[PDB]
């Protein structure tokens, strides 16, 4: 009611859009607060023949802005606002937070390996990769050295932004790909 107004101000959605998403959200999760378990179950539906645990959790952590172990509707709608309608910069910053697991402003080779491993665990079963990129390690070796222009083992936001524009395939798991291609 009054809260719809605030979330309309804080997102790129219209009031009717905020409420339509709320209906869906609350029908899907009546308690209005979904946890990492529920979130993994959501991915499991669409990726039943993989292990989506890891990737779901990494994605969950970006949604859970206040880090309280739940996604409340405000966090849910904001995540969707940014990823669907944000500027290209905003979307890249969102994907950066996904990869930046410890949230220290840098993506390490280890952090990217974890993300890429999680994606392979969830979806690898279904794709056929060229032999040179058929493991997380092979894929990361190439894309991380490509992006790490300071040769310091840690990717800044700028390095990640510039790297992904140059080679959109780096974020091929995200809708952001289509904004870069």
């Amino acid at each position: 009611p009054e809260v719809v107004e605030e979330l309309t101000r804080k997102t790129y959605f219209t009031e009717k859009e905020v409420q339509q998403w709320y209906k869906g959200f609350i029908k899907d999760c009546p308690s209005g607060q979904l946890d990492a378990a529920g979130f993994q179950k959501i991915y499991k539906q669409f990726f039943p023949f993989g292990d989506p645990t890891k990737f779901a959790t990494f994605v969950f952590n970006v949604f859970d802005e206040n880090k309280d172990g739940r996604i409340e509707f405000s966090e849910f709608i904001q995540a969707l606002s940014v990823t669907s309608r944000g500027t290209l910069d905003e979307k890249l910053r969102w994907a950066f937070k996904l990869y930046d697991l410890d949230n220290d402003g840098y993506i390490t080779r280890n952090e990217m390996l974890d993300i890429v491993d999680a994606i392979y665990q969830m979806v690898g079963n279904t794709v056929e990769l060229p032999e040179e990129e058929n493991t997380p390690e092979k894929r990361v070796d190439r894309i991380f050295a490509m992006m790490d222009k300071n040769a310091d083992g840690k990717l800044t936001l700028q390095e990640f932004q510039e790297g992904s524009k140059a080679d959109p395939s780096i974020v091929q798991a995200l809708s952001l790909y289509d904004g870069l291609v």
Partner: peptide
């Protein structure tokens, strides 16, 4: 609801 769940996953991944 699978169509709701599909809709928001699409925003993220499709």
């Amino acid at each position: 609801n699978i169509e709701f769940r599909k809709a928001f996953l699409k925003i993220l991944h499709s």
